[model samples]
Target: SGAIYVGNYRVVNRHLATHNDWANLVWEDSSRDLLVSSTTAQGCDTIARCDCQTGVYYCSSRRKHYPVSFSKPSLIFVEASEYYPARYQSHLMLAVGHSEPGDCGGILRCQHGVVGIVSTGGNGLVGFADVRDLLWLDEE
Candidate 1:
């Protein structure tokens, strides 16, 4: 027999748990939308995109800068949870892109300062990315 797997992305608030300092792609069916959240207990828990690919956020809510200004980096943060009580969880600030297009990014406390995940290393980028800001799991 194979090991059984349990998915937290269910229609109800299953309160899915996971390893600390990691991310999980899930869906808050109560809100009729997909989302991502963290089971990290000590560090900051965030919800980005449910997509397995990196670089792209499901609910890109921030607007891009112009004339390469978008590469300057901006304070980015996000809050996500399974339609807790029935609502799209979000944070105040968000870590946006640091490049124009094909590149990597990170999360910050003050935009380009509070770095967490670095998707670039002076080479080709990996996975999908969103310049719009946050990725809407089930939105246009």
Candidate 2:
């Protein structure tokens, strides 16, 4: 329970580089609050937003346009850390930045080994969390 700040407070993905830094934030559910600056776009891990719309919200997991090939998300106060005993840290805290929180409702590398079930989600990526060849679906 420490650092967890993925812009607009959620919807993060991109292979969880501790929620690197993606931008496209301009949400305001009647001023729930959201708008960002620092535009540096393109890809790495996250971007799925299924159903692609933009301007009212929908873009995530297979919907298209979240990252069919590019993402220009902005902002980067760069900081990182992610730890929790077991359970892949609760699937990396359901997804988070610098680590802790939820977002990343979808991502899969099936033929990468092959496990199934895909209900994708997207948005997030800058740099960090590349624990090369790391493994822990729940460690042994």
For candidate 2, the per-residue lDDT at 117 reads 12
In Å, residue 106's CA in model 2 sits off its true spot by 1.2
lDDT of 2 by residue, 1-140 (tens): 01112222322233332323344432212111111222243223322333221211122322531212212232223322252222221111111112113322223221222111111222443111111122222121
- Which runs of model 2 end up more than 4 angstroms from their true locations? 1-103, 114-132
In TM-score terms, candidate 2 sits at: 0.18
Using Cα atoms with residue i matched to residue i, what is each candidate's TM-score against the true structure? 0.20, 0.18
Off by over 4 Å in 1: 1-24, 27-35, 40-107, 111-116, 123-132, 135-140
**TM-score top scorer:** 1
Residue-pair clash count for candidate 2:
15
Error of 1 at 38 (Å): 3.7
Residue-level lDDT of model 1, residues 7-121, one tens digit each, is 2211111233233212453433222212244332333223332222223222112343211111323323223422244233222222333322222232222222121222222
